[PDB]
Amino acid sequence: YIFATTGYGIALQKGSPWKRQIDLALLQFVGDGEMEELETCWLTGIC
Amino acid sequence: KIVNIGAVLSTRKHEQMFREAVNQANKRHWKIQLNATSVTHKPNAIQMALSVCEDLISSQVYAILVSHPPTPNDHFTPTPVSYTAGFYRIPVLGLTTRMSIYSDKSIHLSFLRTVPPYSHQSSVWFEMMRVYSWNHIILLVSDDHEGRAAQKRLETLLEERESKAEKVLQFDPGTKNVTALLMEAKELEARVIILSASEDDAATVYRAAAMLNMTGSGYVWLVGEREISGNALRYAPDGILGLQLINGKNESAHISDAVGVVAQAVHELLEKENITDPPRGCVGNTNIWKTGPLFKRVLMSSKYADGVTGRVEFNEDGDRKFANYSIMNLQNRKLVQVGIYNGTHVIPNDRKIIWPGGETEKPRGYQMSTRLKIVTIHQEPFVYVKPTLSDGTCKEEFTVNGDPVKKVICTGPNDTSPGSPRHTVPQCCYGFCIDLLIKLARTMNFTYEVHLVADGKFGTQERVNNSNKKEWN
Amino acid sequence: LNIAVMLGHSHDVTERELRTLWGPEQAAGLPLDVNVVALLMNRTDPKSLITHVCDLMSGARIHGLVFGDDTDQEAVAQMLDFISSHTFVPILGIHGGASMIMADKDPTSTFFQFGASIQQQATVMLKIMQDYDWHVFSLVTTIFPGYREFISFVKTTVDNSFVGWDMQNVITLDTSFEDAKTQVQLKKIHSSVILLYCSKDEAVLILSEARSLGLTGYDFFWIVPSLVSGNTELIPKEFPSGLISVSYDDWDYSLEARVRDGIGILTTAASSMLEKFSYIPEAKASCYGQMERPEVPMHTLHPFMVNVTWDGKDLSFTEEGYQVHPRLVVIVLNKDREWEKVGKWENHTLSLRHAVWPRYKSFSDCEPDDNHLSIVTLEEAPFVIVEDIDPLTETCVRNTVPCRKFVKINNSTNEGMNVKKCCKGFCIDILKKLSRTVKFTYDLYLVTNGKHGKKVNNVWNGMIGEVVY
Amino acid sequence: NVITLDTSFEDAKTQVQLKKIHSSVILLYCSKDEAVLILSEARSLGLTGY
Amino acid sequence: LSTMYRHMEKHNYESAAEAIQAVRDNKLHAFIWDSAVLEFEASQKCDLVTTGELFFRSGFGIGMRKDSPWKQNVSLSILKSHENGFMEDLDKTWVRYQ
Ligand SMILES: *[C@@H]1O[C@H](CO)[C@@H](O)[C@H](O)[C@H]1NC(C)=O
Ligand SMILES: *[C@@H]1O[C@H](CO)[C@@H](O)[C@H](O)[C@H]1NC(C)=O
Ligand SMILES: *[C@@H]1O[C@H](CO)[C@@H](O)[C@H](O)[C@H]1NC(C)=O
Ligand SMILES: *[C@@H]1O[C@H](CO)[C@@H](O)[C@H](O)[C@H]1NC(C)=O
Ligand SMILES: *[C@@H]1O[C@H](CO)[C@@H](O)[C@H](O)[C@H]1NC(C)=O
Ligand SMILES: *[C@@H]1O[C@H](CO)[C@@H](O)[C@H](O)[C@H]1NC(C)=O
């Protein structure tokens, strides 16, 4: 059960122009399967 | 030893003052090396060009000083004299030339000016904006070479400030009913108007703006030099901030400055070797000066700190650098000097600025109409789309808890099929996003126009009807 | 009616007059009287040209002038602006000022040159890159005028392109004769194709500097427009071999043929004018009198240049007078310092090349690079399966290596047609992965002679047989 | 891969040898005058970055 | 996955509404779409069952424009809805019908 998800991410200070450069890269990594392959590296559990 | 300098001038007073200026330059620098020879303008077009070319090529003239207009107002641009002098690539300096036709270096090889062009009006907009602290610009520029050059320069100097122009409109010469563009400008949240066109176009725009609510309040009219003369003065509403150049009208001062500039060049010409004799016979010589580009390099590398106007510097375009700008406010159809710019410094006059609106405060170019039109894709689990009742409204249902089901009127096509008339008939749509929209309206003042998808798809890149194009659907 | 043709010093005027008269004789019979007055003269003075055109317009009322001159002066085209804007006569040309067209002015002029449009050249310059399968670019420009439009056009055409070009950050050189900032600007190059937009002397100087800077290697690519090339008889020693250039040369099309085409275009325009009207307008009677305002109420041929076709070839002109279907002959500098035709861009605005890649040899008598390791593949559908290419103005879809397969025409002739085909395979992925580790390029070379190979009287065939020798 | 400079006062081959640098740390084994000369050359060559 | 386009480019439909009908009349043996939509369809209509595991898990969002000044005022509203139970109430009123 999950309530008030508000998932966290990489923070960045106000006025930094690198947000438009980092968000696209992170979205590409998420959509290209980097998260899925790296999930087994750390997210290990018995179900 | 004798070097001839030519000029195409009408009045004999101009010839006399040119002779006096060249004599003073010889006195101010040993031996006499400058000769004065001038010709008169003619009402003809090709005959005058032939006469001046015959009288100029056969006289061994190095420098050309011709004023752009022969009369107070005419279309006789000094194109033919420059083109005739361009056969041997003879350096030409313009006295009062301001049209952008001579600005580009691709066509004109050795034809420069002694006065800044209209392109500096594009740059001075940045100086105005950095003082008024604005970020929205709407352009009303006609379709010509000057307009294209101004647009390109403004885009180049604006793309580096992280600001983008909202809309660009084109004025076709000769048109009379152009109210559609004014309506489109009115339908924009920003209320900053920039105009740069001819006198007739300015008068046509002002005629429509008189009836339309384009000068009542909350608007700023920043125009160029061409709209502060002629019928523009008598048909221009008050509060318009004009632009003028100081010391840019005295032909005697321009001639004196040109003579002073050429005085150093005449002496520096003999410094370099490999100098060739000037061509005497017009017929029998088709050679190219070896020092053609060398003259331009010397002129560009030369620095001047004296003259009626002041310090004179040449940029890559070959015109004056860091020219002085003056703001001519229009108050009760009277010119008022307010702002003076030297390129970087700001020197505003103590007189209060009178805006076209009733209030004397600085207008704000941010008028949020709050008419945020929203289009929602027809998704069954997210938005329940059903036909509305014929009485005029939509029936209200209840959930399992008995709470009313809030809904908004939605407008969209009915058939939603290719090759069918998609009549715009209002419908009754509600769902998950309706509650979010209602919450947004409660939190902040919002008005919603619930549109529907035109075709029925979210839309991706489309590559059809040509070899290469990308338009979102 | 009467059209006068002016040309430079050439063969006898009688032969040129006969060639001009042969135009209407072959076809396009028209009741209008076609009279040609050919003149030959060494002088090209402006006043002499004005007097000559005045004499031509006064005598027999010439309604069309075409000036094909061999003079290299660039002001020849600009000298006729007054004639075009005052006498309302169509203006044509072959060489000289009309060879290169860059003058844009009010549409009141009647300039319609057969030269390559300055903006249209970039389309071919990018299409040859697309055909050669190199999506990375290095846009290098200078302060010379007429290149900001190039930058805007290339940015617009790469933003609207769906191919996925790797548009590397541009480097805008300021000026030459620096020797301190040019290296700083050019040290950021990491691609294989570098453009150059300068003049002839500036290009020679920058190439000479790059010779000492080591930028003239056998792996880099250089694309040069028609401005630097110009005439194809002067080859400075600072130009490396293998350079790719595009221009409008007359290797196949002759001056007489171009004159005939221009005459046919003018006759077609006159015939089209005779449809909506019934009289041919005349210019001013005298060159020395101005008794009326020079307006244009006769509805001249300015908007009628779009629907003009001659000899079954669509030869139209845009609003700026640019040719819709130019030639754009591709010239490549060979190791013997000469230009050879490679590509033609005449048919349906489509270009094809002879596919001659290796042109790098004997530049500095050093670094004999051999990284172009040929890769031989075998048709094995379970592992390496090839197929055709769907038409989408692309060669590679996502990451496939371009496979060049030799195709035979029929069972009688023996010629290997070079047709690109899309190919996907496990071995392709293996090669791509190995490329990132070896840091070298590999061009695939598909074969068709044999499948595996046998020993037929001590003769090797197949892929093994090809790799043995 | 190492880069072995031959001698100074070349102005033609030094750039060819040094154009292959792609790392962040560069060593220098020369004399005082030679080091001064090579650093002055690298100032114009843009190898003195931050 | 290039083999998918060998059949996608010749059997794809234009509307999810008609796609549901087609997959219900045995025309389509499979259908790929968002997990939430399929779960809602399975909860409402009792002639379809989901299968497999979630792939390419990406959330929704609100489309805007780079020059729109309503970024913070919308993000704060979204955070308020998430952390004040408004999203939970909307889910409870629009999920788990049966
Ligand atoms: C200047 O040139 C004109 C035309 O060549 C000539 O008539 C005149 O005598 C010259 N001036 C002097 C002082 O010689
Ligand atoms: C201009 O055109 C619009 C519609 O195109 C029309 O409503 C309006 O009356 C016209 N105005 C004039 C002055 O012709
Ligand atoms: C526009 O101006 C007219 C007068 O020309 C006025 O009657 C009308 O109310 C104005 N419209 C608005 C929206 O202010
Ligand atoms: C003459 O030129 C000077 C600039 O040196 C200017 O200040 C002055 O106003 C001009 N005089 C007239 C009558 O325009
Ligand atoms: C919404 O409009 C009302 C009346 O026009 C105003 O009192 C209120 O302040 C507005 N809301 C905001 C957030 O400004
Ligand atoms: C919400 O109102 C305007 C419109 O976006 C914005 O400028 C303002 O800063 C916002 N309010 C707060 C409290 O941030």
DSSP-derived letter for residue B371 is E
Give the mutation target among B17, B247, B254, B324 for probing the ligand 4 site: most ligand atoms within 8 A of CB: B247
Residue E85: closest C-alpha in chain A: A4
Q: For ligand 5, atom 6, which residue shows the shortest CA distance? A: B445
Number of DSSP helices (H) and strands (E) in chain E, helices first: 5, 0
Is D touching E (3+ C-beta pairs, cut-off 8 A)? no
Structure token digits, residue B286:
């088709």
* B126 vs A11: CA distance, rounded Å: 34
Please answer whether residues C137 and C191 qualify as being in contact, where contact means their C-beta atoms are separated by less than 8 angstroms: yes
Please answer whether residues B141 and B150 qualify as being in contact, where contact means their C-beta atoms are separated by less than 8 angstroms: yes
Q: Which of residues 30-69 of E touch B (CB under 8 A)?
A: 36-37, 40-41, 44, 67
Q: Please, which residues bridge with residue C313 across strands?
A: C310
Tokens 């420059």 belong to B82
C-alpha neighbours within 13 Å on the C-beta side of residue B232: 23
* E34 labeled binding residue: yes
Q: For ligand 4, atom 13, which residue shows the shortest CA distance? A: B250
* C220 vs C367: CA distance, rounded Å: 13
Residue B352 one-letter amino acid: K
User: Strand, helix or coil at E15?
Assistant: coil
Stated resolution in angstroms: 4.0
Over chain C, what HEC string results?
CCCEEEECCCCCHHHHHHHHHHHHHHCCCCCCCCCCCCECCCCCCHHHHHHHHHHHHHCCCCCCEEEECCCCCCCCCHHHHHHHHHCCCCEEECCHHHCCCCCCCCCCCCECCCCCCCCHHHHHHHHHHHHCCCCEECCEECCCCCCHHHHHHHHHHHHCCCCCCEECCCEECCCCCCCCCHHHHHCCCCCCEEECCCCHHHHHHHHHHHHHHCCCCCCCEEEECHHHHCCCCCCCCCCCCCCEEEECCCCCCCHHHHHHHHHHHHHHHHHHHHHHCCCCCCCCCCCCCCCCCCCCCCCCCHHHCCCCCECCECCCECCCCCECCCCCEEEEECCCCCEEECCECCHHHCCECCCCCCCCCCCCCCCCCCCCEEEEECCECCCEEECCCCCCCCCCCCCCCCEEEEECCCCCCCCCEEEEECEEEHHHHHHHHHHHHHCCCEEEEECCCCCCCCECCCCECHHHHHHHC
* B50 vs B39: CA distance, rounded Å: 12
* A36 vs C164: CA distance, rounded Å: 26
Determine how β-strand B111-113 pairs with β-strand B335-341.
Answer: unpaired
Contacts of B98 (CB under 8 A, 6+ apart): B68, B113, B115, B117, B118
Q: Indicate which ligand has the atom closest to the C-alpha of B249.
A: 4
Q: Which of these, C306, C332, C300, C164, lies nearest to C235 by C-alpha position?
A: C332
Residue E39 falls in which region: left (phi positive, over 0), alpha (psi -120 to 50) or beta: alpha
Please answer whether residues C352 and C235 qualify as being in contact, where contact means their C-beta atoms are separated by less than 8 angstroms: no
Q: For ligand 1, atom 1, which residue shows the shortest CA distance? A: B35
Residue C2 one-letter amino acid: N
Contacts of C247 (CB under 8 A, 6+ apart): C116, C225, C226, C229, C230, C232, C328, C329, C331
Does residue B179 line the site of ligand 2, with CB under 6 A?
yes
Task: Give how far Cα C142 sits from Cα of A20, B169, E21, E46, Å.
Answer: 30, 31, 62, 69
Q: Which of these, B5, E26, C215, C449, lies nearest to D19 by C-alpha position?
A: C215
CA distance B455 to chain E (A): 9
Q: Using CB atoms within 10 A of its CB, is residue E17 exposed (0-12), middle (13-18) or buried (19+)?
A: middle
Q: Please, which residues bridge with residue B314 across strands?
A: B320
Tokens 């001590």 belong to C458
Does residue B213 line the site of ligand 3, with CB under 6 A?
yes
Please answer whether residues B264 and B380 qualify as being in contact, where contact means their C-beta atoms are separated by less than 8 angstroms: no
Determination technique for this PDB entry?
Answer: cryo-EM
* E83 vs B279: CA distance, rounded Å: 88
* Angle, vertex CA B342, rays to CA B339 and CA B346, nearest 5: 45
Task: Give how far Cα C273 sits from Cα of B408, C278, C301, Å.
Answer: 61, 8, 7
Contacts of B70 (CB under 8 A, 6+ apart): B10, B41, B76
Please answer whether residues C363 and C215 qualify as being in contact, where contact means their C-beta atoms are separated by less than 8 angstroms: no
Please answer whether residues B377 and B458 qualify as being in contact, where contact means their C-beta atoms are separated by less than 8 angstroms: yes
For residue B182, the surrounding DSSP H or E stretch is helix B179-186
φ, ψ for residue C153 (rounded to 5)? -65, -45
Please answer whether residues B145 and B196 qualify as being in contact, where contact means their C-beta atoms are separated by less than 8 angstroms: no
Structure token digits, residue E17:
């509404």
Q: Which of these, C103, C98, C157, C94, lies nearest to C125 by C-alpha position?
A: C157
Chain Cα centroid distance, residue E92: 17
Four-residue CA torsion sign, B223, B224, B229, B231: negative
Q: Which of these, B210, B219, B157, B221, lies nearest to B188 by C-alpha position?
A: B219
User: Which long-range contacts does E23-28 make (Cβ < 8 Å, 24+ apart)?
Assistant: E23/E48, E24/E48
DSSP-derived letter for residue B102 is G
* C36 vs B182: CA distance, rounded Å: 54
* E77 vs E83: CA distance, rounded Å: 10
* Angle, vertex CA C8, rays to CA C6 and CA C9, nearest 5: 130
Q: Do E15 and B380 touch (CB under 8 A)?
A: no
Please answer whether residues B69 and B76 qualify as being in contact, where contact means their C-beta atoms are separated by less than 8 angstroms: yes
Task: Give how far Cα A26 sits from Cα of A19, B347, E57, Å.
Answer: 10, 49, 14
Task: Give how far Cα B6 sits from Cα of B285, C46, C420, E33, Å.
Answer: 20, 18, 65, 80
Interchain CB contact of C213 with D (< 8 Å): yes
Tokens 């020849």 belong to C76
User: Strand, helix or coil at A32?
Assistant: helix
For testing contact with chain E, the best of A5, A23, A24, A34 (most E CBs within 10 A)? A5
- The dihedral over CA atoms of D21, D27, D30, D34, expressed in degrees to the nearest 10, equals 50
Q: Do A3 and E88 touch (CB under 8 A)?
A: yes
* C296 vs C287: CA distance, rounded Å: 17
* E55 vs B172: CA distance, rounded Å: 55
**Closest CB from B378, B379, B439 relative to E77:** B439
Contacts of B68 (CB under 8 A, 6+ apart): B77, B78, B94, B95, B96, B97, B98, B99
Q: Do C50 and B49 touch (CB under 8 A)?
A: yes
* C295 vs B80: CA distance, rounded Å: 19
- The dihedral over CA atoms of B291, B297, B298, B303, expressed in degrees to the nearest 10, equals 170
Interchain CB contact of D19 with C (< 8 Å): yes
Task: Give how far Cα B332 sits from Cα of B240, B386, E24, Å.
Answer: 10, 60, 77
Q: Please, which residues bridge with residue B304 across strands?
A: B312
* A41 vs A39: CA distance, rounded Å: 5
* B355 vs B217: CA distance, rounded Å: 8
Contacts of A16 (CB under 8 A, 6+ apart): none
Q: Which of these, C291, C249, C292, lies nearest to C114 by C-alpha position?
A: C249
* E13 vs C349: CA distance, rounded Å: 36
* Angle, vertex CA B26, rays to CA B23 and CA B28, nearest 5: 110
Please answer whether residues C149 and C102 qualify as being in contact, where contact means their C-beta atoms are separated by less than 8 angstroms: no
- The dihedral over CA atoms of B324, B22, B68, B12, expressed in degrees to the nearest 10, equals 130
Contacts of B288 (CB under 8 A, 6+ apart): B88, B89
Determine how β-strand B220-222 pairs with β-strand C4-7.
Answer: unpaired
Contacts of C123 (CB under 8 A, 6+ apart): C157
* C333 vs C238: CA distance, rounded Å: 12
Chains sharing 3 or more CB pairs under 8 A with chain B: C, E
C-alpha neighbours within 13 Å on the C-beta side of residue B35: 10
Task: Give how far Cα C122 sits from Cα of B59, C17, C118, Å.
Answer: 44, 38, 8
φ, ψ for residue C224 (rounded to 5)? -125, 130
Please answer whether residues E17 and E41 qualify as being in contact, where contact means their C-beta atoms are separated by less than 8 angstroms: no
Q: For ligand 2, atom 10, which residue shows the shortest CA distance? A: B177
Q: Please, which residues bridge with residue B347 across strands?
A: B340
Interchain CB contact of B380 with E (< 8 Å): yes
Structure token digits, residue C258:
């171009």
Determine how β-strand B92-94 pairs with β-strand B111-113.
Answer: parallel
Please answer whether residues C280 and C270 qualify as being in contact, where contact means their C-beta atoms are separated by less than 8 angstroms: yes
**Closest CB from E56, E58, E82 relative to A5:** E82
Structure token digits, residue C110:
């009647």
C-alpha neighbours within 13 Å on the C-beta side of residue B418: 3
* B247 vs C245: CA distance, rounded Å: 50
Please answer whether residues B78 and B68 qualify as being in contact, where contact means their C-beta atoms are separated by less than 8 angstroms: yes
Q: Do C160 and B468 touch (CB under 8 A)?
A: yes
Please answer whether residues C307 and C316 qualify as being in contact, where contact means their C-beta atoms are separated by less than 8 angstroms: yes
Contacts of C324 (CB under 8 A, 6+ apart): C314, C315, C316, C317, C318
Note the helical H segments in B64-144. Answer: 79-85, 119-132
For residue B5, the surrounding DSSP H or E stretch is strand B3-8
Structure token digits, residue B141:
């520029």
Structure token digits, residue C103:
């003058």
User: Strand, helix or coil at B229?
Assistant: coil
Please answer whether residues C165 and C191 qualify as being in contact, where contact means their C-beta atoms are separated by less than 8 angstroms: no
φ, ψ for residue C284 (rounded to 5)? -65, 140
* C52 vs C57: CA distance, rounded Å: 9
Number of DSSP helices (H) and strands (E) in chain D, helices first: 2, 0
Structure token digits, residue B247:
């010391």
* B471 vs D37: CA distance, rounded Å: 57
Q: Which of these, B253, B260, B264, B324, lies nearest to B295 by C-alpha position?
A: B264
DSSP-derived letter for residue B160 is G
* C83 vs C55: CA distance, rounded Å: 13
Question: What is the Cα gyration radius of chain D?
Answer: 10
C-alpha neighbours within 13 Å on the C-beta side of residue C116: 24
Give the mutation target among B26, B35, B54 for probing the ligand 1 site: most ligand atoms within 8 A of CB: B35
Q: Which of these, B412, B421, B417, lies nearest to B449 by C-alpha position?
A: B412
DSSP characters for B381-402?
TTEEEEPPPTTSS----B-TT-
Contacts of B458 (CB under 8 A, 6+ apart): B377
Residue C197 one-letter amino acid: Y
Task: Give how far Cα B413 sits from Cα of B273, B279, B381, B452, Å.
Answer: 81, 78, 20, 7
DSSP-derived letter for residue B320 is B
Please answer whether residues C317 and C305 qualify as being in contact, where contact means their C-beta atoms are separated by less than 8 angstroms: yes
CA of B442 to the centre of ligand 3 (A): 32
Q: Where are the beta strands (DSSP E) in B114-230?
A: 138-142, 168-171, 192-196, 220-222
Q: Which of these, C104, C120, C195, C196, lies nearest to C157 by C-alpha position?
A: C120
Residues of E in contact with B456 (CB under 8 A): 14-15
Please answer whether residues E47 and E20 qualify as being in contact, where contact means their C-beta atoms are separated by less than 8 angstroms: no
Tokens 């070009």 belong to C165
Q: Which of these, C105, C315, C248, lies nearest to B100 by C-alpha position?
A: C105
